[PDB]
């Protein structure tokens, strides 16, 4: 062996990999700490937690909380923020186990892109599509159908009174995990 997987941070490190575990560790535990603000925007309750949503109009403490989770997600993986919404899964331990950021696109044209291993589809844009920019769940909580619950809550609530359909959702170019999570839906 010689390499480790941290039991509270999830990273696998070791040189210079441990001097990078410290910085991500500190960024992690400080990011996932959810105190529990008043009048949170719960979309669904669960035995293993619940799903809140934050909007760009919310208090500063909620927004700054989201940018620090976001900034944590990006380093764990390596645009216009006024139109986003962010969903967070919190554990019963008052910790954030899942994050999903989706942009409301007003000017998106359906296109088909040829890709052997660009055609227009309409003269007008689609009325509303939900672009998923970030989908993240903490490694020691993965494979527990909790991103699936963030999509299910995404689609029930990203636009009040309507239930997003496969046509009405896009996403940014995925990772292997994002791909492995997507073929869930394709079919
Ligand atoms: C930003 C972009 O748009 S791409 C960014 C993608 N995010 C990441 O890569 C971060 C690291 N990965 C993760 O956080 C998670 O693996 C996510 C976000 C991809 C999905 O979270 P998960 O909780 O694991 O997904 P969830 O449990 O809800 O459903 C996963 C399903 O995907 C399918 N799947 C198959 N293989 C895998 C795999 N290796 N990993 C994940 N899902 C898989 C399964 O059908 C699985 O359902 P099942 O467990 O009942 O068999
Ligand atoms: Zn650690």
mmCIF file of C-alpha atoms and ligand atoms in Angstrom:
data_model
loop_
_atom_site.group_PDB
_atom_site.id
_atom_site.type_symbol
_atom_site.label_atom_id
_atom_site.label_comp_id
_atom_site.label_asym_id
_atom_site.label_seq_id
_atom_site.Cartn_x
_atom_site.Cartn_y
_atom_site.Cartn_z
ATOM 1 C CA UNK A 1 0.000 0.000 0.000
ATOM 2 C CA UNK A 2 1.388 3.348 1.180
ATOM 3 C CA UNK A 3 -1.617 5.338 -0.042
ATOM 4 C CA UNK A 4 -4.539 6.270 2.185
ATOM 5 C CA UNK A 5 -8.190 7.252 1.853
ATOM 6 C CA UNK A 6 -9.091 9.748 4.574
ATOM 7 C CA UNK A 7 -11.944 8.594 6.807
ATOM 8 C CA UNK A 8 -13.576 12.040 7.172
ATOM 9 C CA UNK A 9 -12.402 13.876 4.014
ATOM 10 C CA UNK A 10 -12.570 11.045 1.453
ATOM 11 C CA UNK A 11 -9.410 12.080 -0.422
ATOM 12 C CA UNK A 12 -6.786 9.547 -1.431
ATOM 13 C CA UNK A 13 -3.273 10.961 -0.977
ATOM 14 C CA UNK A 14 0.353 9.792 -0.713
ATOM 15 C CA UNK A 15 5.906 13.955 -0.822
ATOM 16 C CA UNK A 16 3.504 16.702 -1.816
ATOM 17 C CA UNK A 17 0.179 14.835 -1.816
ATOM 18 C CA UNK A 18 -0.207 15.186 1.962
ATOM 19 C CA UNK A 19 0.581 18.889 1.853
ATOM 20 C CA UNK A 20 -2.423 18.948 -0.502
ATOM 21 C CA UNK A 21 -4.598 16.761 1.718
ATOM 22 C CA UNK A 22 -4.319 19.334 4.506
ATOM 23 C CA UNK A 23 -5.593 22.203 2.344
ATOM 24 C CA UNK A 24 -8.467 20.179 0.892
ATOM 25 C CA UNK A 25 -9.306 18.668 4.287
ATOM 26 C CA UNK A 26 -9.581 22.119 5.874
ATOM 27 C CA UNK A 27 -11.578 23.357 2.891
ATOM 28 C CA UNK A 28 -13.824 20.296 3.099
ATOM 29 C CA UNK A 29 -14.854 20.143 6.780
ATOM 30 C CA UNK A 30 -15.347 23.919 6.797
ATOM 31 C CA UNK A 31 -17.442 23.707 3.605
ATOM 32 C CA UNK A 32 -19.770 20.822 4.533
ATOM 33 C CA UNK A 33 -20.595 22.321 7.944
ATOM 34 C CA UNK A 34 -24.300 23.236 7.767
ATOM 35 C CA UNK A 35 -25.573 25.120 10.806
ATOM 36 C CA UNK A 36 -29.209 25.195 9.658
ATOM 37 C CA UNK A 37 -30.598 28.639 8.905
ATOM 38 C CA UNK A 38 -34.153 29.804 9.498
ATOM 39 C CA UNK A 39 -36.781 29.468 6.764
ATOM 40 C CA UNK A 40 -34.777 27.050 4.670
ATOM 41 C CA UNK A 41 -36.308 25.986 1.350
ATOM 42 C CA UNK A 42 -36.886 22.266 1.767
ATOM 43 C CA UNK A 43 -37.974 20.386 -1.350
ATOM 44 C CA UNK A 44 -38.198 16.878 0.148
ATOM 45 C CA UNK A 45 -37.709 15.085 3.454
ATOM 46 C CA UNK A 46 -35.939 11.743 3.757
ATOM 47 C CA UNK A 47 -34.863 9.239 6.426
ATOM 48 C CA UNK A 48 -31.216 10.057 5.654
ATOM 49 C CA UNK A 49 -31.722 13.815 5.337
ATOM 50 C CA UNK A 50 -33.452 16.508 3.270
ATOM 51 C CA UNK A 51 -32.981 18.743 0.189
ATOM 52 C CA UNK A 52 -32.902 22.538 0.442
ATOM 53 C CA UNK A 53 -32.707 24.983 -2.477
ATOM 54 C CA UNK A 54 -31.141 28.444 -2.455
ATOM 55 C CA UNK A 55 -31.925 31.195 -4.960
ATOM 56 C CA UNK A 56 -29.782 34.236 -5.921
ATOM 57 C CA UNK A 57 -32.136 36.537 -3.964
ATOM 58 C CA UNK A 58 -31.506 34.782 -0.626
ATOM 59 C CA UNK A 59 -29.552 36.176 2.352
ATOM 60 C CA UNK A 60 -25.826 36.675 2.084
ATOM 61 C CA UNK A 61 -25.018 33.941 4.616
ATOM 62 C CA UNK A 62 -26.848 31.379 2.467
ATOM 63 C CA UNK A 63 -25.227 32.562 -0.765
ATOM 64 C CA UNK A 64 -21.703 32.806 0.663
ATOM 65 C CA UNK A 65 -22.351 29.315 2.050
ATOM 66 C CA UNK A 66 -23.075 28.140 -1.496
ATOM 67 C CA UNK A 67 -20.048 29.768 -3.104
ATOM 68 C CA UNK A 68 -17.862 28.069 -0.493
ATOM 69 C CA UNK A 69 -19.458 24.689 -1.246
ATOM 70 C CA UNK A 70 -19.116 25.433 -4.969
ATOM 71 C CA UNK A 71 -15.467 26.437 -4.547
ATOM 72 C CA UNK A 72 -14.947 23.170 -2.657
ATOM 73 C CA UNK A 73 -16.587 21.085 -5.400
ATOM 74 C CA UNK A 74 -14.390 22.542 -8.135
ATOM 75 C CA UNK A 75 -11.100 21.751 -6.374
ATOM 76 C CA UNK A 76 -12.286 18.222 -5.563
ATOM 77 C CA UNK A 77 -12.775 17.894 -9.350
ATOM 78 C CA UNK A 78 -9.980 20.189 -10.557
ATOM 79 C CA UNK A 79 -20.600 31.911 -15.430
ATOM 80 C CA UNK A 80 -23.742 34.021 -14.944
ATOM 81 C CA UNK A 81 -24.536 33.479 -11.254
ATOM 82 C CA UNK A 82 -27.678 35.641 -11.206
ATOM 83 C CA UNK A 83 -29.668 32.891 -12.980
ATOM 84 C CA UNK A 84 -28.515 29.869 -10.993
ATOM 85 C CA UNK A 85 -30.282 27.816 -8.384
ATOM 86 C CA UNK A 86 -28.404 25.470 -6.036
ATOM 87 C CA UNK A 87 -29.795 22.356 -4.356
ATOM 88 C CA UNK A 88 -28.029 20.913 -1.312
ATOM 89 C CA UNK A 89 -28.516 17.510 0.336
ATOM 90 C CA UNK A 90 -27.932 17.767 4.083
ATOM 91 C CA UNK A 91 -27.322 14.721 6.239
ATOM 92 C CA UNK A 92 -29.034 14.076 9.560
ATOM 93 C CA UNK A 93 -25.614 15.042 10.980
ATOM 94 C CA UNK A 94 -26.254 18.611 9.721
ATOM 95 C CA UNK A 95 -23.656 18.109 6.974
ATOM 96 C CA UNK A 96 -23.917 18.789 3.237
ATOM 97 C CA UNK A 97 -23.655 15.496 1.349
ATOM 98 C CA UNK A 98 -24.810 16.653 -2.105
ATOM 99 C CA UNK A 99 -24.662 19.709 -4.349
ATOM 100 C CA UNK A 100 -26.320 20.509 -7.696
ATOM 101 C CA UNK A 101 -26.175 23.870 -9.520
ATOM 102 C CA UNK A 102 -28.495 24.534 -12.475
ATOM 103 C CA UNK A 103 -28.728 27.564 -14.776
ATOM 104 C CA UNK A 104 -31.989 28.832 -16.270
ATOM 105 C CA UNK A 105 -31.302 29.426 -19.998
ATOM 106 C CA UNK A 106 -33.495 31.904 -21.860
ATOM 107 C CA UNK A 107 -31.690 31.853 -25.240
ATOM 108 C CA UNK A 108 -30.951 28.187 -25.979
ATOM 109 C CA UNK A 109 -31.348 26.886 -29.537
ATOM 110 C CA UNK A 110 -31.764 23.144 -30.126
ATOM 111 C CA UNK A 111 -28.829 21.983 -32.285
ATOM 112 C CA UNK A 112 -27.631 18.547 -33.412
ATOM 113 C CA UNK A 113 -23.851 18.133 -33.388
ATOM 114 C CA UNK A 114 -22.259 15.456 -35.575
ATOM 115 C CA UNK A 115 -19.629 13.410 -33.702
ATOM 116 C CA UNK A 116 -18.251 10.283 -35.380
ATOM 117 C CA UNK A 117 -16.200 8.060 -32.968
ATOM 118 C CA UNK A 118 -23.786 21.717 -36.938
ATOM 119 C CA UNK A 119 -27.461 21.518 -37.971
ATOM 120 C CA UNK A 120 -30.231 23.850 -36.810
ATOM 121 C CA UNK A 121 -33.442 22.408 -35.389
ATOM 122 C CA UNK A 122 -35.558 25.572 -35.088
ATOM 123 C CA UNK A 123 -35.597 29.244 -36.001
ATOM 124 C CA UNK A 124 -36.651 30.215 -32.444
ATOM 125 C CA UNK A 125 -35.137 29.305 -29.048
ATOM 126 C CA UNK A 126 -36.744 26.954 -26.604
ATOM 127 C CA UNK A 127 -38.936 28.686 -24.011
ATOM 128 C CA UNK A 128 -36.958 27.431 -20.984
ATOM 129 C CA UNK A 129 -34.256 24.811 -20.444
ATOM 130 C CA UNK A 130 -32.453 23.922 -17.228
ATOM 131 C CA UNK A 131 -28.706 23.630 -17.678
ATOM 132 C CA UNK A 132 -26.962 21.546 -15.008
ATOM 133 C CA UNK A 133 -23.515 23.017 -14.390
ATOM 134 C CA UNK A 134 -22.418 20.944 -11.377
ATOM 135 C CA UNK A 135 -23.560 17.652 -9.814
ATOM 136 C CA UNK A 136 -21.554 16.476 -6.812
ATOM 137 C CA UNK A 137 -22.045 14.108 -3.906
ATOM 138 C CA UNK A 138 -19.426 13.356 -1.252
ATOM 139 C CA UNK A 139 -17.501 10.205 -2.081
ATOM 140 C CA UNK A 140 -18.223 8.412 1.186
ATOM 141 C CA UNK A 141 -21.963 8.891 0.437
ATOM 142 C CA UNK A 142 -22.011 7.892 -3.254
ATOM 143 C CA UNK A 143 -24.052 5.043 -4.771
ATOM 144 C CA UNK A 144 -26.857 5.857 -2.269
ATOM 145 C CA UNK A 145 -29.312 7.212 -4.887
ATOM 146 C CA UNK A 146 -28.922 10.777 -3.545
ATOM 147 C CA UNK A 147 -27.949 12.547 -6.778
ATOM 148 C CA UNK A 148 -31.000 10.840 -8.248
ATOM 149 C CA UNK A 149 -33.003 12.584 -5.528
ATOM 150 C CA UNK A 150 -31.395 15.900 -6.442
ATOM 151 C CA UNK A 151 -32.540 15.506 -10.049
ATOM 152 C CA UNK A 152 -35.996 14.391 -8.915
ATOM 153 C CA UNK A 153 -36.197 17.534 -6.777
ATOM 154 C CA UNK A 154 -34.542 19.601 -9.524
ATOM 155 C CA UNK A 155 -37.359 18.622 -11.895
ATOM 156 C CA UNK A 156 -40.166 19.119 -9.400
ATOM 157 C CA UNK A 157 -39.102 22.656 -8.445
ATOM 158 C CA UNK A 158 -36.705 24.353 -10.890
ATOM 159 C CA UNK A 159 -39.779 26.134 -12.283
ATOM 160 C CA UNK A 160 -42.761 26.491 -9.943
ATOM 161 C CA UNK A 161 -45.780 24.495 -11.070
ATOM 162 C CA UNK A 162 -44.126 22.406 -13.791
ATOM 163 C CA UNK A 163 -42.182 19.148 -14.030
ATOM 164 C CA UNK A 164 -39.148 19.338 -16.297
ATOM 165 C CA UNK A 165 -39.000 16.783 -19.114
ATOM 166 C CA UNK A 166 -36.007 15.195 -20.825
ATOM 167 C CA UNK A 167 -36.205 17.821 -23.575
ATOM 168 C CA UNK A 168 -36.221 20.681 -21.035
ATOM 169 C CA UNK A 169 -32.880 19.642 -19.370
ATOM 170 C CA UNK A 170 -29.298 19.911 -20.596
ATOM 171 C CA UNK A 171 -25.973 19.826 -18.765
ATOM 172 C CA UNK A 172 -22.356 20.819 -19.159
ATOM 173 C CA UNK A 173 -19.902 18.333 -20.610
ATOM 174 C CA UNK A 174 -19.655 15.526 -18.069
ATOM 175 C CA UNK A 175 -17.047 13.570 -16.182
ATOM 176 C CA UNK A 176 -16.908 9.768 -16.253
ATOM 177 C CA UNK A 177 -18.971 9.788 -13.051
ATOM 178 C CA UNK A 178 -21.419 12.209 -14.663
ATOM 179 C CA UNK A 179 -21.586 9.898 -17.678
ATOM 180 C CA UNK A 180 -21.936 6.825 -15.455
ATOM 181 C CA UNK A 181 -24.748 8.675 -13.649
ATOM 182 C CA UNK A 182 -26.441 9.790 -16.880
ATOM 183 C CA UNK A 183 -26.960 6.407 -18.565
ATOM 184 C CA UNK A 184 -29.208 5.806 -15.589
ATOM 185 C CA UNK A 185 -31.652 8.128 -17.346
ATOM 186 C CA UNK A 186 -31.059 7.391 -21.043
ATOM 187 C CA UNK A 187 -33.636 4.722 -21.895
HETATM 188 C C1 LIG B 1 -20.476 19.055 -13.712
HETATM 189 C C2 LIG B 1 -20.964 18.058 -14.762
HETATM 190 O O1 LIG B 1 -22.074 18.202 -15.307
HETATM 191 S S1 LIG B 1 -20.299 16.388 -14.542
HETATM 192 C C3 LIG B 1 -19.920 16.285 -12.824
HETATM 193 C C4 LIG B 1 -20.266 14.913 -12.274
HETATM 194 N N1 LIG B 1 -19.998 14.918 -10.850
HETATM 195 C C5 LIG B 1 -18.838 14.202 -10.413
HETATM 196 O O2 LIG B 1 -18.151 13.639 -11.220
HETATM 197 C C6 LIG B 1 -18.439 14.138 -8.907
HETATM 198 C C7 LIG B 1 -18.037 12.778 -8.455
HETATM 199 N N2 LIG B 1 -19.136 11.841 -8.626
HETATM 200 C C8 LIG B 1 -20.366 11.995 -7.804
HETATM 201 O O3 LIG B 1 -20.463 12.905 -6.971
HETATM 202 C C9 LIG B 1 -21.498 10.999 -7.990
HETATM 203 O O4 LIG B 1 -20.935 9.785 -8.441
HETATM 204 C C10 LIG B 1 -22.529 11.491 -9.010
HETATM 205 C C11 LIG B 1 -22.851 12.979 -8.840
HETATM 206 C C12 LIG B 1 -21.975 11.271 -10.396
HETATM 207 C C13 LIG B 1 -23.830 10.693 -8.793
HETATM 208 O O5 LIG B 1 -24.019 10.514 -7.399
HETATM 209 P P1 LIG B 1 -24.578 9.104 -6.929
HETATM 210 O O6 LIG B 1 -25.206 9.171 -5.567
HETATM 211 O O7 LIG B 1 -23.421 8.104 -6.886
HETATM 212 O O8 LIG B 1 -25.718 8.669 -7.974
HETATM 213 P P2 LIG B 1 -27.047 7.871 -7.575
HETATM 214 O O9 LIG B 1 -26.721 6.986 -6.390
HETATM 215 O O10 LIG B 1 -28.203 8.822 -7.212
HETATM 216 O O11 LIG B 1 -27.432 6.966 -8.862
HETATM 217 C C14 LIG B 1 -26.313 6.379 -9.482
HETATM 218 C C15 LIG B 1 -26.667 5.390 -10.593
HETATM 219 O O12 LIG B 1 -25.709 5.633 -11.633
HETATM 220 C C16 LIG B 1 -25.423 4.339 -12.210
HETATM 221 N N3 LIG B 1 -24.095 4.031 -12.109
HETATM 222 C C17 LIG B 1 -23.518 2.956 -12.629
HETATM 223 N N4 LIG B 1 -22.198 2.950 -12.335
HETATM 224 C C18 LIG B 1 -21.917 4.070 -11.592
HETATM 225 C C19 LIG B 1 -20.761 4.629 -10.989
HETATM 226 N N5 LIG B 1 -19.567 4.012 -11.096
HETATM 227 N N6 LIG B 1 -20.870 5.772 -10.321
HETATM 228 C C20 LIG B 1 -22.054 6.403 -10.212
HETATM 229 N N7 LIG B 1 -23.144 5.931 -10.739
HETATM 230 C C21 LIG B 1 -23.128 4.767 -11.439
HETATM 231 C C22 LIG B 1 -26.190 3.312 -11.416
HETATM 232 O O13 LIG B 1 -27.344 2.935 -12.088
HETATM 233 C C23 LIG B 1 -26.524 3.997 -10.162
HETATM 234 O O14 LIG B 1 -27.731 3.473 -9.642
HETATM 235 P P3 LIG B 1 -27.672 2.219 -8.676
HETATM 236 O O15 LIG B 1 -26.696 2.485 -7.553
HETATM 237 O O16 LIG B 1 -29.048 1.989 -8.076
HETATM 238 O O17 LIG B 1 -27.224 0.977 -9.444
HETATM 239 ZN ZN1 LIG B 2 -8.743 13.992 5.125
#
